[PDB]
Each structure stands twice: as structure tokens, then as C-alpha cells.
């Protein structure tokens, strides 16, 4: 069976060792001869949101993605800094506004939502983001939508995880329910985890410091854990 | 958040080294102080379906489960032998009939389906099993149903996997659709994998030779990969 799309789902890189942990993964997938349509990094890109760490991340990852002709999709995590990421990763003017973005890969919509709260480890989605997201999803994409965020909308199966979890999930669920979101890609957790949120599959990739392969079929989305 | 149920999902033990790979996992979870309601083993219990290997498996696992007061749930895999498993694992009269079973854990239904084909590595579900399964699911369980089988009803993301995959999945899907099956537990693959089948979450546990924790919440089922 040939997939419609192939995505790479990497998370929690924590760059400031994390340098060659990520380095060796890149080449391992380069050497596997895999050619994904997109590489999605679901947060905690930089451990202390450092300019130097973003620069370094960009030099390591951009060549890798260009070779495979793959779209790079960056997501804000709790440890990141919105302004330094915009500045040193995206070549955009600095702003503390949520890193929310829409990205079409042929017929597939990828939506990047920012669940980060500046200077806080927990997760939240602000009213303006739910409005933005609702408006966007009112138009169905041909091959449906992948949602990429940091803090996963799933129950916390550990206590030291509850204080840093994504808050007010009911609001998100009200917006996602009945739309064309087919899968939710998330990070934060540091162990591979899957569940559903309002009927939608949630897949959380483990920390880098393995990752997930994502094959998008016409009728299903397959997530596989690569050690 | 307190889960309604906790399940342990272990797969592909391949006992005939596999002995102390499984041994060290048991104790690691014994030592974690985890107390699951059920331990579900999703096939390839014995590598050559050997009487000696079932005896050994039983001596290693039954004490472990009794301590935690956990229900043992055994599933036929491709490598198993229906008659020797019935004989040396279940203390049942030998039979080549599919190992199909229903098991209530308080309000939660667990259904064991046998996708094995004797002397063959591929997977199939026979007409009589679809009838049995349909009849059973006509009655909803209070806390819905977990389905446990060997060959997962998900697309094969590798070629050397297609010849051994579960065949005629459309038939299964016709039976599962709209019933109270909340999750499908599966094995066979040897890499952690999740997808949906007819809207239902499928979670495949990796080979032992790690496993999965399964927390069953009122509104969702969370699967986590334990290295
Ligand atoms: Fe992190
Ligand atoms: Fe196996
Ligand atoms: Mn995080
Ligand atoms: Mn198998």
C-alpha cells in the first residue's frame, strides 16, 4: 500500500549531549533512504530558548530537510522563546504572539498551534487562537488536517506531569469536534504515547534527548516508533 | 486523573535469549509497584509453539500475575499452536478451533480473537468468528470493549510485512463499526505502532524479543510505550 504522505515526527530536542543525539538521528534517517514530505518538530526545540541553540538547530536541520525536499515544520514548546525562535529559526521579526501557522502539503493541511505560555511550563490555548483555529477549520482540506502542538490534549498518567499539562482542553475539543482533523501530533511527555481526544487520534513522540514515522493513508494515519 | 482500568500489553515473547528478556521485564514492572487489572499477551507466545515453551511461560507469568491480582489474557499468535497452548497454558482439552474468548473485567469487556492460521504466518478471520464476534458485540458492555488480536488491522508500512499481514480486513471492519470497541490491542509487528481501523484506535505493542501500559479513562484510552 502506497501512502498519500509521509511525515517525520521528532520532538523535544532540548538544544543549548543533545547536539549529537539529534545529529546521529538525522543521518540514520538520511541513510535509511526515507523521503518524507514534511519534518515536524513538536516543541522544546531549545532547552533555554537560546539564540545560540536556535542557530545551531537550524544549521543541523535545514540542510538535512533540503536534501530530502521536505518541508520543515517548527512548533513552539514550553522551553522555547517565541521571539528568539522567530528571529533565529524563522528569519522573522521578533514577536511574543503565539506561533500559529497553516501549511498545505499538496492536499494535506498541517496546522501549527502554540500551546506554550511564556515563562511557564504548563500549556494553554488562548481565546484568539481558538477563534483563529475554528475559522481555519471551517474550510475542509482535500486530504484532511494534521494538527501539530506541544502539550498533548490527553490525561496525565503521572502526577509530576499534571502541573505542566495542557489546561482547558474542553475548549479545544469543542473546536476540533466534527472538523477534518485526522491526527494530533504532540510532544512534551518524553515517552511514546497515544490516545484519542474527542475521537481524534493523538500521537506523542518521545524525546530526542528516537522519533516517529507518520504514513498518511487515504483512510487512516499510521504512527510508528523508530528507536 | 484516576483511570477506570489499568492493562498491561505485552507482545511477541517467542519462547523456545527470550527467557530472561521477558524475566527482567516482569520484575521491572513488579518493582514499579504497578497493579494492572489485566495482563494481555497479544500473540507469538511460543516461537515454535512448543509444549516445553508454554510450560516455561506459564511458570514465569502466572506467579507474577497472581501477586498483582491481575487477570491473565492470552492471545494466539502466528507462531503458536492452538492445541499445545490449550493443553500446556490453559489446562484445556486440545483443539485446533480458534482461540476466541470473552472476558469481563468488572464493566470492561475484553474480547480475544484468534487471527492465526495454523502452519501459516499470515492472518485471517473465519466466517464463524465474525458471526460469534457480531453476536457478542450486539450487547454493549458498561465500560465498552477492548479487542485483543495478533495480526493488526492496519496497512503494512513494509513489504516483507504484506505477505504475513491480516487478510480480508473489510469484513472485520463491517463487524466492528458502530459497536462499543474502544481500542484494538495487537502484536506481530515488532515496532510500536498506532493507527485507527474503522475509527477505532489500534495500538500495537513492540516485541519482547519493552511493552505497553494501557490506562482506560472514562472518555479515552491511553497507550504508553515502556522501554
Ligand atoms: Fe521537553
Ligand atoms: Fe512475532
Ligand atoms: Mn514540554
Ligand atoms: Mn506474528
User: For the CA atoms of chain A, what is the radius of gyration?
Assistant: 16
Q: What angle do CA A143, A148, A149 make, to 5 degrees?
A: 155
Distance (Å, rounded) from C-alpha A67 to C-alpha A60?
Answer: 12
- Rounded to the nearest angstrom, the gap between the alpha carbon of residue A120 and the centroid of all alpha carbons in its chain is 18
Q: Determine contact, residues A78/A121, Cβ cutoff 8 Å.
A: yes
Checking DSSP bridges between strand B193-197 and strand B181-186, what pairing results, if any? unpaired
Distance (Å, rounded) from C-alpha A144 to C-alpha A3?
Answer: 14
Q: Is A59 on the interface with B (CB under 8 A)?
A: no
Q: Determine contact, residues A186/A205, Cβ cutoff 8 Å.
A: yes
Name the β-bridge partners of B226. B211
Q: Determine contact, residues A221/A183, Cβ cutoff 8 Å.
A: yes
Q: Is A41 on the interface with B (CB under 8 A)?
A: no
* Helix (H) / strand (E) containing B22: helix B18-31
Give whole-number Cα distances, A85 to A54, A82, A114, in Å.
7, 5, 12
3-state secondary structure of A54: helix
For residue A166, how far is its CA from the centre of ligand 3 (angstroms)? 10
Q: Is B223 on the interface with A (CB under 8 A)?
A: yes
How was it solved? X-ray
Q: What percent helix, strand, coil does chain B show, rounded to 5?
A: 30, 30, 45
| B156, B189, B220: best to mutate for the A interface, most A CBs within 10 A | B220
The single residue listed with the C-alpha cell 549531549 is A17
Locate breaks in chain A with C to N over 2.5 A; list the residue preceding each.
Answer: 16, 209
DSSP conformation class of A115: -
Resolution in Å, one decimal, please. Answer: 2.2
Q: Determine contact, residues B116/B76, Cβ cutoff 8 Å.
A: yes
Of A193, A220, A225, Cβ closest to residue B154? A220
Torsion angle of C-alpha atoms B42, B48, B54, B56, degrees rounded to 10: -110
Q: Which residue of B has its CA nearest to A221?
A: B195
Of A191, A192, A215, Cβ closest to residue B157? A215
Q: Determine contact, residues A6/B157, Cβ cutoff 8 Å.
A: no
Look at the domain B1-227 and name its fold.
Purple Acid Phosphatase; chain A, domain 2 (3.60.21)
**Strand-by-strand arrangement of the B145-148 sheet:** A71-74, A38-41, A5-10, A211-216, A221-226, B193-197, B200-204, B181-186, B145-148, B108-112, B101-105
Q: At B166, list the grid cell.
A: 491480516
Name the β-bridge partners of A10. A41
Distance (Å, rounded) from C-alpha A160 to C-alpha B26?
Answer: 25
Note the maximum CA span of chain B: 45
Q: Which residue of A has its CA nearest to B162?
A: A1
Amino acid at each position: 500500500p502506497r501512502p498519500d504522505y509521509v511525515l517525520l515526527h521528532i520532538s523535544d530536542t532540548h538544544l543549548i549531549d543533545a547536539d549529537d543525539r539529534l545529529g546521529e538521528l538525522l543521518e540514520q534517517l538520511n541513510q535509511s533512504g526515507l523521503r518524507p514530505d514534511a519534518i515536524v518538530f513538536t516543541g522544546d526545540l531549545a532547552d533555554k530558548g537560546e539564540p545560540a541553540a536556535y542557530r545551531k538547530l537550524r544549521g543541523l536541520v535545514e540542510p538535512f530537510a533540503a536534501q530530502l525536499g521536505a518541508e520543515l515544520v517548527w512548533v513552539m514548546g514550553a522551553h522555547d522563546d517565541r521571539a528568539e525562535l522567530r528571529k533565529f529559526l524563522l528569519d522573522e521579526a521578533p514577536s511574543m504572539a503565539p506561533l500559529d501557522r497553516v501549511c498545505m502539503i499538496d492536499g494535506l493541511r498541517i496546522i501549527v498551534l502554540d500551546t506554550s505560555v511564556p515563562g511557564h511550563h504548563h500549556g494553554e490555548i488562548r481565546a484568539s487562537q481558538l477563534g483563529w483555529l475554528a475559522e481555519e477549520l471551517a474550510t475542509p482540506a482535500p486530504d484532511g488536517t494534521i494538527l501539530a502542538l506541544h502539550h498533548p490534549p490527553i490525561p496525565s498518567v503521572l502526577d509530576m506531569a499534571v502541573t505542566v499539562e495542557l489546561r482547558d482542553q474542553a475548549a479545544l475539543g469543542r473546536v476540533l469536534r466534527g472538523t477534518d482533523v485526522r491526527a494530533i501530533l504532540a510532544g512534551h511527555l518524553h515517552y511514546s504515547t497515544n490516545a484519542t481526544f474527542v475521537g481524534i487520534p493523538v500521537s506523542v513522540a518521545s524525546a530526542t534527548c528516537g522519533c516517529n514515522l507518520v504514513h498518511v493513508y487515504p483512510d487512516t494515519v499510521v504512527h510508528s516508533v523508530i528507536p
